[PDB]
Design a protein around this ligand. Sequence first.
Ligand SMILES: Nc1ncnc2c1ncn2[C@@H]1O[C@H](CSCC[C@H](N)C(=O)O)[C@@H](O)[C@H]1O
Length: 297
Amino acid sequence: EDYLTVCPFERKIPGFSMSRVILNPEKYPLEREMVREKQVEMRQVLFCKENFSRVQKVLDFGCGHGTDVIQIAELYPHIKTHGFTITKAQAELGNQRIAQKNLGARAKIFNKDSSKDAFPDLYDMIVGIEVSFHIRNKHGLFQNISSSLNEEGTVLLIDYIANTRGPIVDQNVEVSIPTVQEWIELLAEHQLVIDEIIDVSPQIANALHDPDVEQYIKHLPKAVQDLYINTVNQSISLERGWISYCLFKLKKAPHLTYTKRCEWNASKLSKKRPYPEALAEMINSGYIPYPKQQTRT
Ligand SMILES: Nc1ncnc2c1ncn2[C@@H]1O[C@H](CSCC[C@H](N)C(=O)O)[C@@H](O)[C@H]1O
């Protein structure tokens, strides 16, 4: 019932330390509920143009603990959901939770590599939240995605864009972030175009404003210290402006020329929508199909 991503704060909260809350959740359960609400809110903005009544099949190509695989299937009993995660332990846990909720006939998670193992079905919606920057072989991945996307389908991503002339690559942590131009061409090469691109960089940086974090994590066990260092590094790069954290809504445009797909994508990326504007548009529409916020009693 948890999410392995950062989350957007509308403003900085003085004293709020994300590293304390994330790394010591038993000590900060209610603060962790605040975080969870923002994780839900961001996903609501990502999903809020989709018609789940039309969808029959969904894929999550880096599904974490399976939370979206599970929650979509629970909320929309007509849908079948598939997840891929390359981490065996995560796949084991997601399938155990699928079983415990008696969802096995409609939700299934596979311990597979989305850049190499062909997705097993054809999907109306393909979801990658904070997943492709962990994947070195981008063309393998987007070949896989495009080949498994129904003609009228949607791809929904939460991912990074590098605002530099060359891609941002950290070999030791297996992170690779394409530039603007590389994203334009990577998508266009696999028949995809940007329907909507939303920039959440300022809000994310607000949530990750943690002025003592570097000192704090040096007083934590090495193991604990090693897993959060990537979040620290991402926070720094967002603050510098080297990367942008964005929500992508993609469609297939197979009948458009490659050049026209490039020109479309470049135009969308030249005027990314601010998240507060997209969030306010969602609230004003009143249409919020997925996820739902948790409520007491
Ligand atoms: N090549 C690959 N194939 C499949 N999954 C991969 C992958 N590389 C990274 N991942 C997965 O991508 C996820 C990144 S963390 C994001 C998890 C989930 N989308 C969430 O929102 O909470 C992890 O589950 C990791 O195992």
